[PDB]
Amino acid sequence: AEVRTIKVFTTVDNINLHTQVVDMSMTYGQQFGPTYLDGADVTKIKPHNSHEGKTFYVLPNDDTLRVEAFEYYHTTDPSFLGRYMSALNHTKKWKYPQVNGLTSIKWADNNCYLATALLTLQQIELKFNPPALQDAYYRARAGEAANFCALILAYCNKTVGELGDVRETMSYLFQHANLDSCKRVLNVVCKTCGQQQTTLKGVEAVMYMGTLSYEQFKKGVQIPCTCGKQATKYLVQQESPFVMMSAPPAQYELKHGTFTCASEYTGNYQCGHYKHITSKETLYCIDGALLTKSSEYKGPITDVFYKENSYTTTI
Ligand SMILES: COc1cc(C(=O)Nc2ccc(S(=O)(=O)N3CCCC3)cc2)cc(C2CCN(C)CC2)c1
Ligand SMILES: COc1cc(C(=O)Nc2ccc(S(=O)(=O)N3CCCC3)cc2)cc(C2CCN(C)CC2)c1
Numbered sequence: 505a506e507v508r509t510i511k512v513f514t515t516v517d518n519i520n521l522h523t524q525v526v527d528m529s530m531t532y533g534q535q536f537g538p539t540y541l542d543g544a545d546v547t548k549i550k551p552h553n554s555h556e557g558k559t560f561y562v563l564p565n566d567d568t569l570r571v572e573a574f575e576y577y578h579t580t581d582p583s584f585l586g587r588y589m590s591a592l593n594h595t596k597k598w599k600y601p602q603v604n605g606l607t608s609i610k611w612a613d614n615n616c617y618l619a620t621a622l623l624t625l626q627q628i629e630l631k632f633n634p635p636a637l638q639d640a641y642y643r644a645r646a647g648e649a650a651n652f653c654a655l656i657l658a659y660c661n662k663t664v665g666e667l668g669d670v671r672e673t674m675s676y677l678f679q680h681a682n683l684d685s686c687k688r689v690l691n692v693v694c695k696t697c698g699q700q701q702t703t704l705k706g707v708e709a710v711m712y713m714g715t716l717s718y719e720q721f722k723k724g725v726q727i728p729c730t731c732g733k734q735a736t737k738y739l740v741q742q743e744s745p746f747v748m749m750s751a752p753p754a755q756y757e758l759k760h761g762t763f764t765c766a767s768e769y770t771g772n773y774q775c776g777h778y779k780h781i782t783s784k785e786t787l788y789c790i791d792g793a794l795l796t797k798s799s800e801y802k803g804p805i806t807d808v809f810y811k812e813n814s815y816t817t818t819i
């Protein structure tokens with residue numbers, strides 16, 4: 505005939521908390537659809553006295569929740585919260601040790617790519633546009649990176665345990681970063697075809713694929729031209745607080761004081777292991793929870809990050 509109730513809050517953003525009177529004879533699922541209590545799926549659980557006043561995540565299935573989700577995450581996909589909460593149930597059980605002053609991740613579920621990306625973000629000037637990434641990145645820097653890692657996986661449409669790529673991950677994250685004032689001018693000189701200047705803005709201005717060396721990029725890299733000859737491409741001008749230089753993994757020497765940090769990738773095309781190298785008073789190799797130092801480093805490098813502000817060529 506009737507039922508005892510308690511009050512809970514529902515949310516999509518953990519900023520707007522919506523009061524609900526819940527029926528203790530029904531599951532959360534029967535009342536809200538998919539329901540989460542800090543990452544755990546409580547869809548098939550009934551309300552208990554200890555739930556009173558707690559905050560539960562639900563999917564944005566009305567105009568109020570869609571707008572709160574859009575404003576906080578910058579996403580229009582209602583399955584986003586599903587992917588976030590699913591990932592969060594795993595990432596909350598990972599460990600985030602401080603290693604050489606940075607939040608790292610102890611190895612689990614092929615998360616070596618996320619560890620190296622997390623370590624990279626803490627050493628380059630990058631501000632996120634979605635309030636969700638601002639809030640979770642701040643917590644990650646203080647050593648609580650579970651929410652941040654879960655958000656990265658949701659934004660990249662990757663599940664816990666999927667193999668990942670640092671370059672691919674940084675590329676998705678950069679789309680959600682404020683890079684509008686980033687600018688790159690390239691010149692391409694071909695003996696036959698002549699000169700062509702190109703101006704790039706945003707992500708295209710901070711990422712390059714084909715050489716690991718910022719110095720080589722400034723001096724000139726050879727690339728095929730449509731005449732069938734090789735042309736030379738060189739960086740004329742750079743306005744950005746960092747650049748990311750990427751290439752297929754190859755044996756490469758990293759020299760102390762000449763870069764910020766780098767990603768090493770050992771193994772093969774379809775599986776392998778990432779490590780992070782950082783240039784401090786010496787070269788530190790961070791491998792999840794593990795730390796080794798050396799004055800020199802040679803290894804298979806895929807990505808090198810360099811600090812920048814303003815560069816103009818003298819060529
Ligand atoms: C009582 O039954 C409901 C069901 C759902 C639902 O979204 N179901 C649903 C299942 C699987 C999936 S899923 O498999 O696609 N996946 C996406 C992420 C997590 C699960 C998505 C949605 C939602 C409601 C609420 C609708 C709004 N009012 C105000 C409150 C009730 C009631
Ligand atoms: C609480 O204040 C509101 C916020 C938004 C919103 O969509 N905000 C919002 C921000 C950034 C972004 S964004 O960063 O993802 N980006 C994508 C395209 C343009 C901006 C998207 C959405 C919408 C409303 C409603 C007020 C009354 N209703 C009937 C109409 C809308 C209220």
Ligand SMILES: COc1cc(C(=O)Nc2ccc(S(=O)(=O)N3CCCC3)cc2)cc(C2CCN(C)CC2)c1
Nearest residue numbers: 668669670713752753769771772773774775776806
């Ligand atoms: C182990 O040997 C590797 C070789 C390559 C390669 O050349 N990939 C590759 C991608 C796009 C492009 S491209 O689309 O950007 N474009 C540029 C020139 C040709 C196509 C070019 C090359 C890539 C990998 C990665 C495989 C797994 N990830 C996690 C890390 C390393 C490993």
Ligand SMILES: [Cl-]
Nearest residue numbers: 631632638641
């Ligand atoms: Cl930020």
Ligand SMILES: [Cl-]
Nearest residue numbers: 763764810811
């Ligand atoms: Cl640097």
Ligand code: NA
Nearest residue numbers: 625626628630
């Ligand atoms: Na940073």
Ligand SMILES: [Zn+2]
Nearest residue numbers: 694697729731
């Ligand atoms: Zn040419």
